[PDB]
Amino acid sequence: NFPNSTNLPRNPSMADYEARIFTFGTWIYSVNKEQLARAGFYALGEGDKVKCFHCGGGLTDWKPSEDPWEQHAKWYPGCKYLLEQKGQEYINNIHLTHSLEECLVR
Ligand SMILES: C[C@@H]1CN(CC(=O)N2CCc3ccccc32)CC[NH2+]1
Ligand SMILES: [Zn+2]
Numbered sequence: 463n464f465p466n467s468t469n470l471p472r473n474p475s476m477a478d479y480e481a482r483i484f485t486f487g488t489w490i491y492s493v494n495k496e497q498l499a500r501a502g503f504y505a506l507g508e509g510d511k512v513k514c515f516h517c518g519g520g521l522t523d524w525k526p527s528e529d530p531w532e533q534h535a536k537w538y539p540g541c542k543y544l545l546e547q548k549g550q551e552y553i554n555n556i557h558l559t560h561s562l563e564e565c566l567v568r
Pocket of ligand 1: 520521522523524525528533537
């Protein structure tokens, strides 16, 4: 499924922080559910899989060292909600960091 890059959310029922928070329930996983919800994510109830309400972008297998906002930017750089919340300065930082990470290792 293609990422939504319009200013209009793919899932408006999940636009409110509160609505997103309810989707998690008891959350056993290594990443913080409030932190996920703040970054626009809601739970699908499929292990630790989340989707952004806005871009629809999905993400799984959360390691303790993976930040919701950073991962949002890594995989869904066109997300208008991300751009609104964080800014383009932050998005660029994050991408430069990841590209330089995936080059320093090799
Ligand atoms: C939290 C991170 C996420 N990583 C990428 C990931 O989960 N992606 C990348 C694109 C995609 C589409 C659909 C479902 C998942 C994913 C994996 C490691 N943990
Ligand atoms: Zn998004």
